[PDB]
Amino acid sequence: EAICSALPTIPYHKLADLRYLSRGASGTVSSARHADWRVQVAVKHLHLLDSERKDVLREAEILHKARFSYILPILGICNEPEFLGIVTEYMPNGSLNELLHRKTEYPDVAWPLRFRILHEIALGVNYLHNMTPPLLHHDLKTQNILLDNEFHVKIADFGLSKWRTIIYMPPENYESIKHDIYSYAVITWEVLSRKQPFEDVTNPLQIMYSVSQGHRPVINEESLPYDIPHRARMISLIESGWAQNPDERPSFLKCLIELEPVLRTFEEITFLEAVIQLK
Amino acid sequence: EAICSALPTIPYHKLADLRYLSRGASGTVSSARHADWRVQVAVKHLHLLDSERKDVLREAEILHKARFSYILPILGICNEPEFLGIVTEYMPNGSLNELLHRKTEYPDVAWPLRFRILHEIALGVNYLHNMTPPLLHHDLKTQNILLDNEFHVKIADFGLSKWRMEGGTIIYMPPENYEPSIKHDIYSYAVITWEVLSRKQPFEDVTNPLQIMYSVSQGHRPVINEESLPYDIPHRARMISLIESGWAQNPDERPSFLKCLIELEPVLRTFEEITFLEAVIQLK
Ligand SMILES: COCCNC(=O)c1ccc2c(c1)nc(-c1cnc(-c3ccc(Cl)cc3)[nH]1)n2CCOC
Ligand SMILES: COCCNC(=O)c1ccc2c(c1)nc(-c1cnc(-c3ccc(Cl)cc3)[nH]1)n2CCOC
Ligand SMILES: [Ca+2]
């Protein structure tokens, strides 16, 4: 039959210890504990308009329909006249952004884990592109790639997501199935370098202009050191992913076929050991 | 108004490297990779009657509706004239049963990990009991507690499960269910807890399963002495209390899962986070 799973509704009073965590353009994120299920959860609520209410409902429906191993799992919706929020699993280790840039907190991030994150991000986006109809993310950034208790990836933020900061935006989009792979390429560069794309650029309009002229985050010995595993191969993947001509950018299938033999070179235990080193 | 998510249908041909993994009373389990999704998967299938299709589709529907952090995630349903099967995430570490009893492979299983497993099983079952209407598992056993890459729990096998509106072991079955109840699962859980804490097969001495059933109806339980549960077991007294109330002869005396959670929460807080990762590395 047309087997359908319903998203549970969660009474606001069931969400005990509601406390602020972070705020983004998407909304405010708070932690809480479910009174009956006795688990820690996360809540994404608005900062009560008629259309801003449909936005939250659209995202919730997207998360519920796009369930998969690498997508942030939705636990239910809290829809009341007094409060509106999305309830998801709690991700204790935050975002990929924090992992790459909080360098005193995380001085070392072993290569196996960086490559694992890269593979999972790709698995997550590939799944969205393979849904019917294809779901396009259109807002991939390190800030919305979340990390669970053992540093596995959960993709989030489906606000700009369509059913078929600007440093991750392809140049043609300043004024398409090939958008996400562009963003993925920038992310890949960021993960392998632990540097902010276009560091010396003061103004975001200079970035937008340079990008439209074909400039891309710098690739040299200083940004991507020679000790990077599979360096040459990764540089090629990055460079094809952020290509100026969208048609020259690979699909996520191609991207995964290229990545698979790279991930096989890391022994399973090195992933575990990479994690145990972290704070 | 009502937000619905549909379970994907997976064409058989999309499952590459289909290879036998294990058998049980539940059916055959094979491993595979999804050709488009590029992930490894598990496939529970029969190994033709139309009578069996309703069973597989019933379980698929339950797994799809009972989605939660400690419930085995269903990825799709493979329903064709040639083949019928449930596609789920692959759990590389197998079952709690194999962890407890492969003693040469796993000489040590750290107390913190054991407690986290127990805590997660209870969280899973608790969630099932809090659904509207409540879902009752009715076939909990260590063989059905599956373990992911970091030894987190995923509850499987909802074949005998029911909404409150096949030859296997009977050791996890409450005695009132023998001859022709929201208190079934807790009894199973209590046996599971004893098994987890002792790494001993319940009713080890008794060879004939009928004898067990007699013994059990006559009030008997798995042995709670020093030989089975050493004195050096973290929170021994609090645990034995839980086990004993869990497998009471009178269903009314047995506690809810919510109650167990309330008891287990302080116990889990006594272990530092680092110990779980250490336990998983010790097992690799
Ligand atoms: C009080 O201390 C604040 C410091 N910040 C953190 O340590 C922290 C921890 C976890 C965070 C965190 C900060 N910010 C987020 C976060 C960012 N975006 C989300 C989110 C996105 C979409 C949805 Cl639907 C739900 C959550 N969570 N998460 C993950 C929440 O689990 C989902
Ligand atoms: C060739 O033999 C290799 C040795 N077998 C194993 O080590 C092994 C590994 C993992 C196993 C394994 C053996 N047996 C199972 C298993 C047992 N029951 C299930 C299962 C039950 C219900 C559903 Cl709906 C799906 C899977 N999987 N799993 C987990 C599969 O991921 C779900
Ligand atoms: Ca060993």
Nearest alpha-carbon partner for A60 in A84, A80, A29, A91: A84
Asked whether A38 and B258 are in contact (CB, 8 A), the reply is: yes
d(CA A213, CA A235) in angstroms, rounded, equals 20
- B144-B149-B155 Cα angle (round to 5): 20
Catalytic annotation, residues of A: 139
| Edge-to-edge order in the sheet of strand A15-23 | A15-23, A28-34, A40-45, A84-89, A74-79
Question: Which ligand number lies closest to the CA of residue B283?
Answer: 3
Q: SS3 of B176, please?
A: helix
Stated as kind and residue range, the H or E segment containing B23 is strand B15-24
Would the CB of B91 count as within 6 Å of ligand 2?
yes
CA B50 vs CA B53, B55, B57, B64, B135: distances in Å: 5, 9, 11, 21, 25
Q: Nearest Cα to A186, choosing from A160, A219, A159, A210?
A: A219
- The structure was resolved experimentally with X-ray
Q: Which structural domain, as residue segments, surrounds residue B261?
A: 1-284
Q: Are B12 and B82 in contact (CB under 8 A)?
A: yes
Rounded to the nearest angstrom, the distance between the alpha carbon of B209 and the centre of ligand 2 is: 26
Task: Kindly identify which residue of chain A lies nearest to residue B150, measuring between CA atoms.
Answer: A150
Q: How remote is the CA of residue B278 from the centroid of ligand 3, in Å?
A: 13
Best of B10, B18, B22 for a ligand 2 pocket test (most atoms within 8 Å of beta carbon)? B22
Mark yes or no for CB contact A5/B2 under 8 Å.
Answer: no
Chain B residues in contact with A269 (beta carbon < 8 A): 281, 284
Q: Select the residue of B5, B75, B284 nearest A272 (Cβ to Cβ).
A: B284
Using alpha carbons, select from A156, A105, A61 the residue that is nearest to residue A277.
Answer: A105
Matching residue, tokens 């590029």: B38
- The CA R_g of chain A, rounded to the nearest whole Å, is 19
Cβ neighbours of residue A232 closer than 8 Å, sequence gap 6 or more? none
Sign of dihedral through CA atoms A176, A66, B18, A148? Answer: positive
The best mutation among A30, A146, A147 to test binding of ligand 1, ranked by most ligand atoms within 8 Å of the C-beta, falls on A146
Q: Residue A179, class by beta-carbon neighbours within 10 Å (0-12 exposed, 13-18 middle, 19+ buried)?
A: buried
The CATH number of residue A178's host domain is 1.10.510.10
- Looking up tokens 């990825």 gives B75
Query: DSSP E strands: which ranges in chain A?
Result: 4-6, 15-23, 28-34, 40-45, 74-79, 84-89, 135-136, 145-147, 153-155, 162-163
| Helix and strand numbers, DSSP H then E, in chain B | 8, 10
CA distance B14 to A194: 37
Q: For chain A, how many helices (H) and strands (E)?
A: 8, 10
Please tell me the distance from the alpha carbon of residue A67 to that of residue B193, in angstroms, as a whole number. Answer: 32
The response to whether B215 counts as a known ligand-binding position is: no
Q: Which helix H or strand E contains B146, and what residues bound it?
A: strand B145-147
Report the residue of chain B nearest A41, measured CA to CA: B69
The span from the first CA to the last CA of chain B, in angstroms, equals 47
Structure tokens at B88: 């789920």
- Experimental structure resolution, Å: 2.7
Answer whether B220's CB lies under 8 Å from B280's CB. no
Pick the ligand that lies closest to the CA of residue A24.
1
Q: Report the interhelical angle of B184-198 vs B257-268 (nearest 10°).
A: 30
Rounded distance from Cα B93 to ligand 3 centre (Å):
13
How many domains is chain B partitioned into structurally?
Answer: 1
What residues of chain A have any CB closer than 8 angstroms to a CB in chain B?
1-7, 36-39, 57, 60-61, 64-65, 67-69, 73, 75, 77, 89, 123, 126-127, 130, 149-150, 253, 256, 260, 268-269, 272-273, 275-276
